[PDB]
Amino acid sequence: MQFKVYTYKRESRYRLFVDVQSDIIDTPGRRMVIPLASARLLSDKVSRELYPVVHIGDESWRMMTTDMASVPVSVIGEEVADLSHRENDIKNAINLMFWGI
Amino acid sequence: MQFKVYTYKRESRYRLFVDVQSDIIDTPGRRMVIPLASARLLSDKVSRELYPVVHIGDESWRMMTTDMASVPVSVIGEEVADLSHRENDIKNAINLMFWGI
Ligand SMILES: [Cl-]
Ligand SMILES: [Cl-]
């Protein structure tokens, strides 16, 4: 579901991802998602407009916008959070990646 | 480069992809792309709004919008076409996938 955050059932580069696909767009067995990376070890000079910082499980995470990809429903694990309150920033980041200024 | 079509240097599910990332968005060593599938064998009931049909090399191809993913510059092969003339349809398909109606 759009803006919901899930874990991967299979080993991957990242441990969490946010579903960003519209709920009215039907793609049987798959969903478009954006992985979340731990913000701790990462650099602060990285654009927050393109890579928003979110807070889940008492920690900060970076939305890896440019790592967007589709995942089969078979790898979608537990739902751990809901990022619908950051819709504005998520929307801005995605549009920026494709259409720029 | 945005809207340019390239071949994959490495074996993949598809043989062509269109770069859809903004030219002003810098992501060292990577680009966001959408694969193109041969339209011949495929079904005609599939939405053209979400999966535009393009013409390259005297054949028809379907833009696999929901198969969007980033690819490292190391796998980008020969540039074979330019789809900038279909910018409107490509833009509409991408926006539809994320924001729906
Ligand atoms: Cl947050
Ligand atoms: Cl065309």
Curated annotation (Swiss-Prot), chains A, B:
Phenotype when the gene is knocked out: Disruption of both ccdA and ccdB has no phenotype, except for increased plasmid loss.
Classification via InterPro entries: CcdB, Plasmid_toxin/cell-grow_inhib
Database matches in Pfam families: CcdB
BP terms from Gene Ontology: negative regulation of DNA-templated DNA replication; negative regulation of DNA-templated transcription; plasmid maintenance
GO MF annotations, alphabetized: DNA topoisomerase type II (double strand cut, ATP-hydrolyzing) inhibitor activity
Outcome of substituting residue 101 to R: Loss of toxicity
Effect of residue 100 to E/R: Loss of toxicity, no decrease in protein stability. Still represses ccdAB operon, still forms complex with CcdA
Family statement drawn from the similarity comment of this UniProt entry: Belongs to the CcdB toxin family.
Function comment: Toxic component of a type II toxin-antitoxin (TA) system, functioning in plasmid maintainence. Responsible for the post-segregational killing (PSK) of plasmid-free cells, also referred to as a plasmid addiction system. Half-life of over 2 hours. Cell killing by CcdB is accompanied by filamentation, defects in chromosome and plasmid segregation, defects in cell division, formation of anucleate cells, decreased DNA synthesis and plasmid loss.
Reported impact of residue 99 to L/Q/S/Y: Loss of toxicity
Keywords: Plasmid, Repressor, Toxin-antitoxin system, Transcription, Transcription regulation
Name of the featured protein: Toxin CcdB
Gene3D superfamilies the UniProt entry points to: 2.30.30.110
Domain of life: Bacteria
Quaternary assembly: Homodimer. Forms a complex with GyrA, probably a tetramer GyrA(2)CcdB(2), in which GyrA is inactive. Forms a complex with antitoxin CcdA; there are both high- and low-affinity binding sites for CcdA such that both CcdA-CcdB(2) and CcdA(2)CcdB(2) complexes can form. The CcdA-CcdB(2) trimer is sufficient for rejuvenation, whereas maximal operon repression occurs with CcdA(2)CcdB(2). When the CcdA:CcdB ratio is lower than 1, a CcdA(2)-CcdB(4) complex is formed which is devoid of repression activity. In this case repression is alleviated and both proteins are produced.
Organism taxonomic ancestry: Bacteria, Pseudomonadati, Pseudomonadota, Gammaproteobacteria, Enterobacterales
